Design a protein around this ligand. Sequence first.
Ligand SMILES: O=c1ccn([C@H]2C[C@H](O)[C@@H](COP(=O)(O)NP(=O)(O)OP(=O)(O)O)O2)c(=O)[nH]1
Ligand SMILES: O=c1ccn([C@H]2C[C@H](O)[C@@H](COP(=O)(O)NP(=O)(O)OP(=O)(O)O)O2)c(=O)[nH]1
Ligand SMILES: O=c1ccn([C@H]2C[C@H](O)[C@@H](COP(=O)(O)NP(=O)(O)OP(=O)(O)O)O2)c(=O)[nH]1
Ligand SMILES: [Mg+2]
Ligand SMILES: [Mg+2]
Ligand SMILES: [Mg+2]
Ligand code: NI
Ligand code: NI
Lengths: 164, 164, 164
Amino acid sequence: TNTLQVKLLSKNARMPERNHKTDAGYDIFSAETVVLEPQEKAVIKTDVAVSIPEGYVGLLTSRSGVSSKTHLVIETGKIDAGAHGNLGINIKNDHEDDKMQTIFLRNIDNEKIFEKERHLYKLGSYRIEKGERIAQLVIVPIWTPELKQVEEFEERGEKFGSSG
Amino acid sequence: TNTLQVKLLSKNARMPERNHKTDAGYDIFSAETVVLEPQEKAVIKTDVAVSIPEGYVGLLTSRSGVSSKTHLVIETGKIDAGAHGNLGINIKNDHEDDKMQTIFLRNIDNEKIFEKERHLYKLGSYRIEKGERIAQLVIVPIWTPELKQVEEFEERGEKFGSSG
Amino acid sequence: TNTLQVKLLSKNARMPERNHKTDAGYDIFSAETVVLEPQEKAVIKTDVAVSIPEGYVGLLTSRSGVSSKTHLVIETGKIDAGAHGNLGINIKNDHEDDKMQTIFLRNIDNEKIFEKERHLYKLGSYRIEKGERIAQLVIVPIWTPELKQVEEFEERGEKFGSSG
Ligand SMILES: O=c1ccn([C@H]2C[C@H](O)[C@@H](COP(=O)(O)NP(=O)(O)OP(=O)(O)O)O2)c(=O)[nH]1
Ligand SMILES: O=c1ccn([C@H]2C[C@H](O)[C@@H](COP(=O)(O)NP(=O)(O)OP(=O)(O)O)O2)c(=O)[nH]1
Ligand SMILES: O=c1ccn([C@H]2C[C@H](O)[C@@H](COP(=O)(O)NP(=O)(O)OP(=O)(O)O)O2)c(=O)[nH]1
Ligand SMILES: [Mg+2]
Ligand SMILES: [Mg+2]
Ligand SMILES: [Mg+2]
Ligand code: NI
Ligand code: NI
């Protein structure tokens, strides 16, 4: 069986699409429109549940476009084989909370938002829109063997940057 | 040989346990009780040394429970095949150092500590306890071939978020 | 074919060297000398273009020596199979911007720079030198199947730190 089961949990959810043929990642879409303040942590719900087969792991990881342009930090999620729950994106707006305020919100391309209705926001605040690609899923085979205590092993020695 | 050798280096160390059958990660325990101040970086010693076989890599990576609840940031460690040293967890308390102080320390579940003896700590300080699961190990097969200079290759072009 | 094609784009580029025989990563060299201010984000150009074969992914990831010693944060890059562009290192100097200033710049080993010509820099500023190993490349096989909507699946339930 060379197929992965994908289950949508709501109308807000969307089917993950792969960009190119040789590409590794499945672009994951957001199911909600959230505003993240500086240093604010949240879990972005995808409303998408997947089933990874045994002997594999899913890497719900950051997209290189958004992560290099914005202060949005995604902690790569290790989706266990047999985890049939809602995939949540572990996000953090790492932008400095320098107490300053602006009238412009920022999107996932670090662009000033063009709101007709004026509001005051914290400097370095971002907005994730619904149906917006913020993360991607990369499935990679694992290796989980048995483990036993040993006094010594069956070499690089015992070396955190031994060289420079 | 479908077995991985695990060597404890002290009484403070503990054997890494896998949660479920289909799960990818081996939950790694802390061997020391450390207090991390805001923006303080440290290497948490596990007192556990493992031997990954050639053609594989170990990912000493963050647990999704602690990383989403707390400001504790673990930089995923790429444990080389044949590295028989003490596994160290590359940690950083990324919480804002806003100079404020509180009498409550925080644990790996972001809960106020109930200390009977009163002390003053920096706001957003965390404590890792001994024998506490803060990180996990995921072994994944690699691929290391020979490499040669080429003027041109044998396509996605030369594209950092070409789409959005 | 058990070979990976590596293409240098300039004289500033260098051939990635693997440290040991059992090691997973290819140490990636910098092609430019950049100074990163506190909280400053940049893309460090390697001037190196590689071609990963289909069914694999490249992990342009942080070196454990530099990442544990310095506030330099590298967001692991997922180099798609068939991406023949310049490998860019997604970097962020995560050091606090506490407005303080010093006369000493810091290198990738967190050491005070010994400049004969005196200058004023921001506290916690780092310098990447040309031909300096700041990141590494780890190639790991992937698994990309077809995907179809399912009402229910063919278990760990729907569980973000169910245990602690
Ligand atoms: O989080 C970590 C990262 C690395 N390590 C260990 C395992 C690994 O074999 C070693 C360093 O591996 P890397 O090549 O990833 N870092 P670096 O190239 O700076 O160290 P060296 O130059 O000595 O290989 O340190 C940990 O224990 N925890
Ligand atoms: O750190 C990085 C990350 C990506 N890259 C390159 C390789 C990869 O093929 C490309 C972008 O891959 P991703 O799918 O991971 N990011 P994104 O989906 O935003 O870009 P695109 O939409 O163009 O695929 O940029 C780097 O050189 N360094
Ligand atoms: O970013 C993430 C990370 C994890 N998850 C899901 C998938 C995974 O199976 C589950 C938790 O997996 P981990 O073992 O990596 N974290 P933890 O050990 O804290 O949770 P548990 O103890 O319940 O396994 O949560 C996400 O949806 N997004
Ligand atoms: Mg992509
Ligand atoms: Mg777990
Ligand atoms: Mg190395
Ligand atoms: Ni920060
Ligand atoms: Ni990673």
